[PDB]
Write a protein that binds this ligand. Structure first.
Ligand SMILES: *[C@@H]1O[C@H](CO)[C@@H](O)[C@H](O)[C@H]1NC(C)=O
Ligand SMILES: *[C@@H]1O[C@H](CO)[C@@H](O)[C@H](O)[C@H]1NC(C)=O
Ligand SMILES: *[C@@H]1O[C@H](CO)[C@@H](O)[C@H](O)[C@H]1NC(C)=O
Length: 171
C-alpha cells in the first residue's frame, strides 16, 4: 500500500487505513521515527506530534493537526496482524493567493503572477480558450487579439484562485 496525500499548512489530514478486523496495537512512523502508537492499551505520541495527532483505535487511521512543512514526509503504519506495509507520502502545501494580471501595450505582452502557493501552476485563458500553463509564479504571453478578457488561474494540489481582466490598449 502507498498513498499520496496533500495537506495545507496549519490544516490537518487523515491517513485512512482499511477498516475491517480491529487492531489491537498500531504504530505510525514518519520515515524511521515514531509518530504515535496504540501499545499495550495505551496511547502516546512523540516529538512534534504530541498534542496534535489523533489515532483511531479501530482502524488505526492517523489524523495530524496543525500541519507544518516539516511534516512533509513518508509515513508508515504497522500492526502485528497486518502483513503488508501502509505507506503514505504527505505533501504540505501553502495555498495560492489571488493572481495579478498586468500588461505592456507596446509589445502586446500580458503577464500573470501570483505571490503565495507551493508548486503553483498558472493557467491563462482568453474567452473560452486555454492559451497556456506554466509551473511558475509568473507567466507572460504575447497576445494576438483582444476580443475577450483574459483569465489567469493559479492552482496547486490544495487550492486555486483566479483573476479576470480586460486589457486596455490603444487600437
Ligand atoms: C481539520 O481540517 C478540516 C478540513 O480539512 C476542517 O473541517 C477542520 O476544522 C479541521 N479540524 C480542526 C480540529 O481544526
Ligand atoms: C499551529 O502551529 C503554529 C506554530 O507553528 C501556531 O499557529 C500554533 O502553535 C498552532 N495553531 C493552532 C490553531 O493550534
Ligand atoms: C516588452 O515585451 C517583452 C517580451 O516581449 C517583456 O519582457 C517586457 O517586459 C515588455 N515591456 C517593455 C517595457 O519592454
Amino acid at each position: 500500500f502507498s498513498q499520496q496525500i496533500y495537506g495545507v499548512v496549519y490544516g490537518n489530514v487523515t491517513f485512512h487505513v482499511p477498516s475491517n478486523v480491529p487492531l489491537k496495537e498500531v504504530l505510525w512512523k514518519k520515515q524511521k521515527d515514531k509518530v504515535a502508537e496504540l501499545e499495550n492499551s495505551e496511547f502516546r505520541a512523540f516529538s512534534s506530534f504530541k498534542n496534535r495527532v489523533y489515532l483511531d483505535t479501530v482502524s488505526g487511521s492517523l489524523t495530524i493537526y496543525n500541519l507544518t512543512s516539516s511534516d512533509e514526509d513518508e509515513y508508515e503504519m504497522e500492526s502485528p496482524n497486518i502483513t503488508d506495509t501502509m505507506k503514505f507520502f504527505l505533501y504540505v502545501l501553502e495555498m495560492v493567493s489571488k493572481p495579478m494580471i498586468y500588461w505592456e501595450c507596446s509589445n502586446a505582452t500580458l503577464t500573470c503572477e501570483v505571490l503565495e502557493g507551493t508548486d503553483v501552476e498558472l493557467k491563462l485563458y482568453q474567452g473560452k480558450e486555454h492559451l497556456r500553463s506554466l509551473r511558475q509564479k509568473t507567466m507572460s504571453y504575447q497576445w494576438t487579439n483582444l476580443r475577450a478578457p483574459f483569465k489567469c488561474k493559479a492552482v496547486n494540489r490544495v487550492s486555486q484562485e483566479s483573476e479576470m481582466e480586460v486589457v486596455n490598449c490603444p487600437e
